[PDB]
């Protein structure tokens, strides 16, 4: 805003008639813009008019802040709910991961005992078969019964 100082320098400038027509025209513009945008607004401005204006800015700012707050809050919640989900999911998977983890070797080293049981027996059979063939020339009908059991098949 043109301080009373600066305005008066312009009015003494324009006083002199032999001032250039580029500086006279420039100096009255200065006074045109200056009056244009603010002087003119203070032609009406009542202490009440601009109290309401100031108050309305205030309302508008809080309304704007509040809407922003609303938005941010909804976003944070949604990120939070995804983390909760994933966590109900981390819980559950590492549960079954462990529930599978040795049910697997409950059943597995169950097995490697049922293996050497199989091998225990298989070896009894291999030795019986041996004996059988040491005495195969005898045509022993009982031995033949036994031999026929050994090589009998439905594995």
Segment holding 48, helix H or strand E = none
Establish if 42 lies at the interface with its own copies (CB under 8 A). Answer: yes
Pattern 3-32, its own copies, x by CB under 8 A = xx--xx--x--xx-xxx-x--xx--x--xx
Q: Is 16 helix (H, G, I), strand (E, B) or coil?
A: coil
Pattern 108-137, its own copies, x by CB under 8 A = x-xx--xxxxx-xxx-xx-xx--x--xx--
Main-chain phi, psi angles of 3, to 5 degrees: -55, 145
- The minimum distance between CB 150 and its own copies, in angstroms, equals 7
- Of the candidates 22, 74, 107, 139, which one interacts with its own copies according to CB under 8 A? 107
Angle (CA) 42 46 47, round 5°: 115
Among positions 87-106, residues that touch its own copies (CB under 8 A) are 87, 89-90, 93-94, 96-97, 100-101, 103-104
Among positions 56-85, residues that touch its own copies (CB under 8 A) are 57-58, 61, 64-65, 68-69, 71-72, 75-76, 79-80, 82-83
* CA–CA dist 79, 43 (Å, integer): 54
* CA–CA dist 45, 32 (Å, integer): 19
**Contact between residue 147 and residue 130 where contact means Cβ atoms under 8 Å apart:** no
């Amino acid at each position: 805003p043109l301080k009373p100082e600066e305005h008066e320098d312009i009015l003494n400038k324009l006083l002199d008639p032999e001032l250039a027509q580029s500086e006279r025209t420039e100096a009255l513009q200065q006074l045109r813009v200056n009056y244009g945008s603010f002087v003119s607004e203070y032609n009406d401005l009542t202490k009440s008019k601009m109290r309401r204006d100031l108050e309305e800015a205030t309302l508008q700012h809080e309304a704007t802040a509040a809407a922003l707050r609303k938005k941010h809050a909804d976003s944070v919640a949604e990120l939070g709910e995804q983390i909760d989900n994933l966590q109900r999911v981390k819980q559950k998977l590492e549960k079954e991961k462990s529930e599978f983890k040795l049910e697997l070797d409950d059943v597995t080293s169950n097995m490697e005992q049922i293996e050497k049981e199989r091998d225990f027996y298989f070896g009894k059979l291999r030795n019986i078969e041996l004996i059988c063939q040491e005495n195969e020339g005898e045509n022993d009908p009982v031995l033949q019964r036994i031999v026929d059991i050994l090589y009998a098949t439905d594995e």
